[PDB]
């Protein structure tokens, strides 16, 4: 899929991820798989109550991701 290619393009960039449960994970995208499975590092997580935490290493299953925010560095795939 076209969006998937753009996701792989964001590998190595800082991205934000919201899960199906609304926890919000911000940090560096290390690896993005075809099914949207996401390996990230040096995370800041913001829970539904508002509290924050810090994690070194995480991996989130694609299905249980609601969405991702990518840099605007990418915006400039205009062919489609």
């Amino acid at each position: 899929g076209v969006p998937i290619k753009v996701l792989h393009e964001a590998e190595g960039h800082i991205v934000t991820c919201e899960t199906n449960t609304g926890e919000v994970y911000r940090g560096k995208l290390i690896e993005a798989e075809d099914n949207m499975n996401c390996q990230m590092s040096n995370i800041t997580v913001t829970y539904r109550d508002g509290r924050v935490a810090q994690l070194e290493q995480v991996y989130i299953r694609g299905s249980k991701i609601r969405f991702l925010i990518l840099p605007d560095m990418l915006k400039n795939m205009l062919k489609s």
């Binding site: 969006p3 753009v6 694609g62 925010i69 605007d72 489609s80």
Partner: protein, 85 residues
Amino acid sequence: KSSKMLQHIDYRMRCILQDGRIFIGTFKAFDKHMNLILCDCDEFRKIKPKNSKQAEREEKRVLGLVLLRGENLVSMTVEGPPPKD
């Protein structure tokens, strides 16, 4: 024709999520699953304004460049024309 999505491409689009959020951004790409690419995207919670005399905008958040997974998409309508840029 397959066009029904391709028509609205480049347009500003109002997308409704399964939890009931409103994502408004520039519709730039989609796919088989309806995973969507939304440029200059904001999120609304309380309302979609039709000129609500009190205010039009409460709980608006600037997100930016958004990829939404199709699993969590419900529906889309045209919000405004393409920005020229």
